[PDB]
Design a binder for this molecule. Sequence first.
Ligand SMILES: CCCCCCCCO[C@@H]1O[C@H](CO)[C@@H](O)[C@H](O)[C@H]1O
Ligand SMILES: *[P@](=O)(CCCCCCCCCCC)OCCCC
Ligand SMILES: *[C@@H]1O[C@H](CO)[C@@H](O)[C@H](O)[C@H]1NC(C)=O
Ligand SMILES: *[C@@H]1O[C@H](CO)[C@@H](O)[C@H](O)[C@H]1NC(C)=O
Ligand SMILES: *[C@@H]1O[C@H](CO)[C@@H](O)[C@H](O)[C@H]1NC(C)=O
Ligand SMILES: *[C@@H]1O[C@H](CO)[C@@H](O)[C@H](O)[C@H]1NC(C)=O
Length: 377
Amino acid sequence: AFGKLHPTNPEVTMNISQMITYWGYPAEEYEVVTEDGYILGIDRIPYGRKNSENIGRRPVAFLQHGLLASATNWISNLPNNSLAFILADAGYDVWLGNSRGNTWARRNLYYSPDSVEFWAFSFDEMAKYDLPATIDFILKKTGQDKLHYVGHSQGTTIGFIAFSTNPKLAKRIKTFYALAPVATVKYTETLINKLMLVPSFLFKLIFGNKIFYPHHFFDQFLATEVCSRETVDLLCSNALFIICGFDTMNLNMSRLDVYLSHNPAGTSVQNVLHWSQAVKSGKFQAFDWGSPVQNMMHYHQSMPPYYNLTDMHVPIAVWNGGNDLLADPHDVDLLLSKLPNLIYHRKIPPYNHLDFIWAMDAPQAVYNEIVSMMGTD
Ligand SMILES: CCCCCCCCO[C@@H]1O[C@H](CO)[C@@H](O)[C@H](O)[C@H]1O
Ligand SMILES: *[P@](=O)(CCCCCCCCCCC)OCCCC
Ligand SMILES: *[C@@H]1O[C@H](CO)[C@@H](O)[C@H](O)[C@H]1NC(C)=O
Ligand SMILES: *[C@@H]1O[C@H](CO)[C@@H](O)[C@H](O)[C@H]1NC(C)=O
Ligand SMILES: *[C@@H]1O[C@H](CO)[C@@H](O)[C@H](O)[C@H]1NC(C)=O
Ligand SMILES: *[C@@H]1O[C@H](CO)[C@@H](O)[C@H](O)[C@H]1NC(C)=O
């Protein structure tokens, strides 16, 4: 049988602002330019359908997605269960970032997306250039002094790096809301572990030296034709669970077409390679460019420098899942034992890695608590 469970959701083919206006919310596009030339397309929802107060003074909430994802991560479902829309209706001026390399931040001033140099970056550069550039842009635009930073996965990784090496930037973050925080990955539980322990050499032999898993036409075929049909349905949902952990009943099966037609959103092979070094070393450190000389040219050292969570003094609230296979409890716990200004920690036992952005009960489990916390800030 395997018949289409539902007619293709319109969001499947919309870009960020299309989805926002699709739900009746105000959408605004902008693009940041990183010191090193990358052009990042960022989006904003100035007010919500339910709150238009203090226009021009609304507190800023910046949501940063993680590896191979995009800003849609925060507006992937309904207005009542998608963080971005909720923050809007809660009275916030919501900004959604996009990391270099993804669907909407894949353009540089100096290099061609088809050049090797273009994809010669990892989350190091996202922390060092993407964030400063994006946050600086938002605050100069809105006129606010600080903003509320919410990150997910690698979205928190770049936040840890920046806010701990950039004293000036850090001072502009009201509270750091980290969902499925990732500083190290030496205890991840997902099968995709091993693909990360393969020698760098082989990794590049397999994938290449440029783009990594971006959105293809075929991704759309599977998205609209496989993730929408009755039983073949499970191929999509289980591919997601093998990566994030199991919480089968929290995922809206009627929206897999939306999720997979937007994820992955691509990134550099280097970035995934950097994460690979992380899975192997089990440490939290900068990228190894592959030679004392190249690292010299980057760190003035022979070995990339280690990142210190102990120097990340921004008040941080953490939410991690007991069933997350990426931001596993063990790595998260080591991360919590270092953070100097932990203001909050809530471990949601059944939560997996994707729940933080798509769990049908995310509002009650996490979002409402974030709204509450940001409200008394
Ligand atoms: C957490 C936000 C989503 C991140 C991107 C998930 C991509 C899901 O897509 C899956 O990716 C797997 C690994 O590449 C593949 O094995 C599967 O074939 C593919 O369907
Ligand atoms: P987050 O940004 C997780 C994003 C999920 C993308 C899935 C990629 C699969 C590769 C993982 C292999 C272990 O954290 C990034 C840390 C991943 C190491
Ligand atoms: C999204 O779609 C709208 C309308 O088609 C278009 O104006 C806008 O440029 C698109 N955004 C991006 C970044 O592609
Ligand atoms: C959101 O709206 C859907 C659709 O009616 C509803 O089923 C769900 O329970 C709502 N969730 C929340 C947290 O409001
Ligand atoms: C699941 O997604 C479908 C399609 O968008 C929607 O009609 C339904 O209300 C959603 N259910 C929940 C619990 O959000
Ligand atoms: C972490 O602290 C050590 C202490 O000397 C320092 O050498 C290192 O550079 C710090 N990490 C960064 C990159 O700030």
